Amino acid sequence: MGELVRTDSPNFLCSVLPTHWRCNKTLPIAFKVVAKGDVPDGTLVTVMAGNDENYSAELRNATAAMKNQVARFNDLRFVGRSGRGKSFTLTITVFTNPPQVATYHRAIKITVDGPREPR
Amino acid sequence: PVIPAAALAGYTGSGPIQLWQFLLELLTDKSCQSFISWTGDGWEFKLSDPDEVARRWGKRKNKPKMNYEKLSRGLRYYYDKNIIHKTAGKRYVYRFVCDLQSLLGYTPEELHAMLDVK
């Protein structure tokens, strides 16, 4: 239960992510992937990220299991950085037969500091 | 000041001096052996008076509230960076695990003699 957003796939939605966050820092709101069509409970869901500056960002707890059409990620974090003024392209993969993948461009910017007030 | 420890460590003046470079600077000064010194085993050292070391660290960094508790948290951050490690079981004893010989140009045996470490 929350506020969802559409992904690049017509079969999946995901919770909202901050536009800018500090690397290795817990997210303000737990990331969730919701399936439109019927997906078997227990089905694994994973998330990856990268872009032109970082082809594959280091992530923590990027694996979750589907339960009632909802894959709730427990404390997903982004360790790798996206670069000055650059965002990550998320790749969400639902492991069915065959695997379904849903991307999400310009999902989130990750820096060492994260959001900070002027100085 | 037997040798320019801080300088040989990479400190040129750019920005604040780093904690490990600061400790090295104290370990190369005969007058500071009362509160910090080499144990005689390679680059292993011990803070015989952690409070005093913390005070100077704070003074050098302009942080009057600096105390050993916080200085040691800085040391614990060096574990993963392989700059300094803790000698398990020995109160206030740590060890430089980076390549000090290359940086300083002297081996521990030589430095211990130059500093007359008894």
Next chain:
Amino acid sequence: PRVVPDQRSKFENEEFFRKLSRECEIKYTGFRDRPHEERQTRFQNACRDGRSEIAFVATGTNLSLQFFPAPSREYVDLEREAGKVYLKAPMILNGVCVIWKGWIDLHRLDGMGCLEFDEERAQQEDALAQ
């Protein structure tokens, strides 16, 4: 809705797919924080299991691959060339049945790859959706 109606057009219109059609640069995203040695074994051994993690370096688009039809032999090749490894894996990307295809140097852990519409799977899928 496992797929989009205009599945055929989607692959020949959207820049996302068009940019991933040519022999783009690919690379193994697995355990980048580990020694190159361990990454080599992990990558090969997992390939033998029919799975891997490759991303198109150029665009940084990551993908989790599963080399199996809708241990293999034609989906995971190891004879076509000494050192190189030709892989193949189907999937549904953004509502479009496609087939990933490329190779990787068992030493350099990188190579080239690309996507190509899957007339067969696309068809079948569209029927199930009606």
Next chain:
DNA sequence: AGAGGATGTGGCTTC
């Protein structure tokens, strides 16, 4: 005593 997580702060560099 000591390990290590969470998060803010000032120095400095690059866009």
Next chain:
DNA sequence: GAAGCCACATCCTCT
């Protein structure tokens, strides 16, 4: 100058 990257400085929880 804003927005990055760094190396802590603070504060705490747990053994």
